[PDB]
């Protein structure tokens, strides 16, 4: 499967001595995600800020492969605007295993959205300057549109994310969002983003990612709220879920967006929309929103 993917070190290998590791950006059992400086990793710059995911110096022989798979998969997928850009890696012996991606200034979308709760209006109005730097339904529909586009792309190159959530979406410059993974596909309570077929039968498909995409939409339109607020993720949660229970509409959604969340939460994988359809439907909503 993944282990069998090609790592062309001549094109991605980067000198560990050209990286000045900085402040941690996130922790994990696998190891860490650190901010850093790359001396001439790309060409349009001399010194660039990059994000680096790396294992613990005493990391298992298993994770070492997990991280190598991610590197191979990211390479296989190729470049897309809404997928965090892979810049390089460090496989050679000597230092720990490291994957290097572009740095996204504003970090994960969940945190970001939460900080704009008191800076959000559905639609801007004149003066129009009293709203400069406010989030609007257009922004939210756009973020969802972009993620759906990146997932369509992942589908296209036949890959699945496995843990699609707001915390794994990064806000870059000019309202451009990028899909990423701070983990190595847990205090992050991942069951909240899993489709029933995944929870009960541990089966991961592109359609279960669509279920996750539904939780992400609820996250975006709750302005960063936490999925299944207050609810205890236990035996009964898994049960109720399979029985057909879903979350109520978030605080800033629109009738259509909430319906789309529901569409994504169909109990039947094959009854859930597909990312292409989602990209088309969302695009419509975006364009329908501008009008009014
Ligand atoms: C304030 N800025 C940040 O906190 C920050 C962290 C960051 O961390 C990383 C560092 C390395 C990474 N490697 C990934 N893997 C990844 C990214 C996208 C996709 Cl689609 C897939 C997978 F596995 F699904 F193919 C895997 N995500 C990563 C995220 C990258 C950019 N900005």
**What are the boundaries of each domain within the chain?**
1-103, 104-288
Among the CATH numbers 1.10.3720.10, 3.90.1150.10, 3.30.200.20, 2.40.30.10, which is that of 1-103? Answer: 3.30.200.20
Experimental determination approach used: X-ray
β-partners of residue 89 are 13, 99
Please indicate whether residue 68, judged by its CB atom, sits closer than 6 Å to ligand 1. Answer: no
Instruction: Give nearest CA residue, ligand 1 atom 18.
Output: 180
The reply to whether 21 sits in an annotated binding site is no
The reply to whether 53 sits in an annotated binding site is yes
Checking 1-9 for CB contacts under 8 A at 24+ apart, the result is 2/65, 2/69, 2/72, 2/73, 3/65, 3/68, 3/69, 5/69, 5/72, 5/73, 5/75, 5/76, 6/72, 6/75, 7/68, 7/71, 7/72, 7/75, 7/91, 8/75, 9/91, 9/92
Cα-Cα-Cα-Cα dihedral sign, residues 29, 34, 38, 42? positive
CA angle 159, 164, 169 (to 5 degrees): 110
Which residue from 243, 188, 191 is spatially nearest to 212, judged by alpha carbons?
191
CA torsion, ordered 44, 148, 166, 233, to nearest 10 deg: -150
- CB-based contact 42:87 (threshold 8 Å): yes
Please indicate whether residue 177, judged by its CB atom, sits closer than 6 Å to ligand 1. Answer: no
94 CA distance to ligand 1 middle (Å): 24
Please indicate whether residue 176, judged by its CB atom, sits closer than 6 Å to ligand 1. Answer: no
Both tokens of residue 87?
A: 């810049």
Report the atom number in ligand 1 closest to the C-alpha of 162.
Answer: 24
Please indicate whether residue 70, judged by its CB atom, sits closer than 6 Å to ligand 1. Answer: yes
Please indicate whether residue 159, judged by its CB atom, sits closer than 6 Å to ligand 1. Answer: yes
3-state secondary structure of 50: strand
The reply to whether 230 sits in an annotated binding site is no
Among the CATH numbers 1.10.760.10, 1.10.3720.10, 3.40.50.1820, 1.10.510.10, which is that of 104-288? Answer: 1.10.510.10
Cβ burial of 253 (10 Å; 0-12, 13-18, 19+) is: buried
198 CA distance to ligand 1 middle (Å): 23
- CB-based contact 69:5 (threshold 8 Å): yes
The single residue listed with the structure tokens 């050209």 is 18
Report the atom number in ligand 1 closest to the C-alpha of 86.
Answer: 13
Mention every residue, 6+ apart, whose C-beta is less than 8 A from residue 217: 144, 253, 257, 260, 261, 264
């Amino acid at each position: 499967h993944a282990e069998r993917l090609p790592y062309d070190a001549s094109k991605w290998e980067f000198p560990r001595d050209r990286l000045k590791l900085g402040k941690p950006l996130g922790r994990g059992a696998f190891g860490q995600v650190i901010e850093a400086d790359a001396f001439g990793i790309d060409k349009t710059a001399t010194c660039r800020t990059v994000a680096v995911k790396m294992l613990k110096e005493g990391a298992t022989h298993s994770e070492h492969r997990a991280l190598m798979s991610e590197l191979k998969i990211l390479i296989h997928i190729g470049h897309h605007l809404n997928v965090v850009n892979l810049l390089g890696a460090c496989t050679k012996p000597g230092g720990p295993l490291m994957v290097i991606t572009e740095f996204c200034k504003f970090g994960n979308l969940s945190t970001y959205l939460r900080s704009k709760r008191n800076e959000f209006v559905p639609y801007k109005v004149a003066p129009e300057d009293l709203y400069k730097d406010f989030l609007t339904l257009e922004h939210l529909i756009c973020y969802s549109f972009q993620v759906a586009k990146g997932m369509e792309f992942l589908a296209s190159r036949k890959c699945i994310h496995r843990d699609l959530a707001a915390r794994n979406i990064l806000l870059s410059e000019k309202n451009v969002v990028k899909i990423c993974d701070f983990g190595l596909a847990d205090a992050r309570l991942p069951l909240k983003w899993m489709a029933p077929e995944t929870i009960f039968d541990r089966v991961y498909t592109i359609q279960s990612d669509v279920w996750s995409f539904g939780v992400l939409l609820w996250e975006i339109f709750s302005l960063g709220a936490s999925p299944y607020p207050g609810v205890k993720i236990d035996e009964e949660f898994c049960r109720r879920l399979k029985e057909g229970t879903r979350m109520r509409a978030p605080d800033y959604t629109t009738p259509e967006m909430y319906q789309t969340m529901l569409d994504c939460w169909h109990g039947e994988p094959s009854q859930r929309p597909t990312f292409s359809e989602l990209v088309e439907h969302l695009g419509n909503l975006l364009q329908a929103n501008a009008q009014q």
